[PDB]
Amino acid sequence: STASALGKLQDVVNQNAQALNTLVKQLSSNFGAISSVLNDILSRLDKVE
Amino acid sequence: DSFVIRGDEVRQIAPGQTGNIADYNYKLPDDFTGCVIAWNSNNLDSKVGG
Known part of the structure; x- marks a missing residue:
């Protein structure tokens, strides 16, 4: 019933996803x-320029 | 390598140049090393009749 009891693993997965996502997004920068x-x-x- | 060129195309003789003589007549390497010397020869290389 009670969610949010597994914060550590969810945080790890979210951190990896965010790092990958921002690395991908960096392509669009100038x-x-x-x-x-x-x-x-x-x-x-x-x-030559 | 020596020759004569029309006056205005003088700056076509450079690496990575695009023009008429730059690609149809004489192309320089992109990583060329050396020097280029240009001067006018109007009094001899020009004719009143052309």
Whole structure:
């Protein structure tokens, strides 16, 4: 009946999931680039730049 | 490597350049090492009749 009695394991799983999710989400960041997609910045631009 | 070029295309002679002579006539390597020297030869390489 009583839930929330298993906080440790649930916390561990949530921590792993959050770390993975934010690692995946980091792909969309720009980091000061012009875009977060390689193909478009490759196509719109030229070689030496 | 020596030749003559139209005046405006002078900056096409560089690694990773795109143009007419840069890709149809003479392409430089991207990791080229060395120097490029450009100067005008109007008084000899030009003709009033062309």
